[PDB]
């Protein structure tokens, strides 16, 4: 492993130091349908005419990115994405920009969001939940080894590929940092106590989010929920969690450790790093090597009907893509 990571850090660093730019053009793609919509952009299923491949094209409105002060975060996202490589991280195939928008073209994950399947099914059995959790454990070990913090773990950002494996998406909050960071960002239900308390935090917030994920996947609902964020924040910092009666004793033990408000006792952040997680009882049946190689039997296989199919994604209101006659935020995005 430490051998694998060593070589991984070498490849990341070369790309990190010399990121690729403008590797494609808007008119090389056929705009098909919207797969998701955000505050400063949207993602559409796209088709590359030269190869006939389908991709997920993320279109970000430069002016909106500026109004929401997400410039540096957007630069982080593209720069990090074009340099990483793991089987559970979606691939950035191309990136470019025009007068009005920034564009990031990634691999299309037809399976849809874990969110959708989770809410429909209700809850995943422990073996199912464990299968996905394992993948997040290795992905974080990988990312963290690169001095990267992900900061936005949740079902909405995890996709299921054809083989039933996870593909982490949305790196808008990803950041390479040695030392503490203070940006308040993420999603309410998944924010660690340190973040909500504005006290400088590190990679340990990712391990806490994992604890929230595993709980939600297994119970069908998050450990901390309420109609308004402030109520949720109040629960998160209280350091009080209740477990369904069906949670195995080992599952509860793993979560008590991950959902530790005291980030000096929180698993993943201790002296033995991720191993305190990997060597945990709840993970005894887990073969980490098998998972990384994708040779483990997937519990759920989302099936589709050929490429270009979007039935596993909700429908969104379409909106024509417009590009002004004038460049809009040149200097802000020069490095993109």
């Amino acid at each position: 492993v430490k051998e694998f990571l060593a070589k991984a850090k070498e490849d990341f660093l070369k790309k990190w130091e010399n990121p690729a730019q403008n590797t494609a053009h808007l008119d090389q793609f056929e705009r098909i349908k919207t797969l998701g919509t955000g505050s400063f952009g949207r993602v559409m299923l796209v088709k590359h005419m030269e190869t006939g491949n389908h991709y997920a094209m993320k279109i970000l409105d430069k002016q909106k990115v500026v109004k929401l002060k997400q410039i540096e975060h957007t630069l982080n996202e593209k720069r990090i994405l074009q340099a990483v490589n793991f089987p559970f991280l979606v691939k950035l195939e191309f990136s470019f920009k025009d007068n009005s928008n920034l564009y990031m073209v990634m691999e299309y994950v037809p399976g849809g969001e874990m969110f959708s399947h989770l809410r429909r099914i209700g809850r995943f059995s422990e073996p199912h939940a464990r299968f996905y959790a394992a993948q997040i454990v290795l992905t974080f070990e990988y990312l963290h080894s690169l001095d990267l913090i992900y900061r936005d773990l949740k079902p909405e950002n995890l996709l299921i590929d054809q083989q039933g494996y996870i593909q982490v998406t949305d790196f808008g909050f990803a950041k390479r940092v040695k030392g503490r960071t203070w940006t308040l960002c993420g999603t309410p239900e998944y924010l660690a106590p340190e973040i909500i308390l504005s006290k400088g935090y590190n990679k340990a917030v990712d391990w806490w989010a994992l604890g929230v994920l595993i709980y939600e996947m297994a119970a069908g609902y998050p450990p901390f929920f309420a109609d308004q964020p402030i109520q949720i924040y109040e629960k998160i910092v209280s350091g009080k969690v209740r477990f369904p009666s069906h949670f195995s004793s080992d599952l509860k033990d793993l979560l008590r450790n991950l959902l530790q408000v005291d980030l000096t006792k929180r698993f993943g952040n201790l002296k033995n790093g991720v191993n305190d997680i990997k060597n945990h009882k709840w993970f005894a049946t887990t073969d980490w090597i098998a998972i990384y190689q994708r040779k483990v039997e997937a519990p759920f296989i989302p099936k589709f009907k050929g490429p270009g199919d979007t039935s596993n994604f909700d429908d969104y209101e379409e909106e024509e893509i417009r590009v002004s006659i004038n460049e809009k935020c040149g200097k802000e995005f020069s490095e993109f």
Partner: peptide, 20 residues
């Protein structure tokens, strides 16, 4: 049941991220 309280809450849809 917690499940019932969750399903009846306004937080069962896609949750938006926060920052500012």
């Amino acid at each position: 049941t917690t499940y019932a309280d969750f399903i009846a809450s306004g937080r069962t849809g896609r949750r938006n991220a926060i920052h500012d």
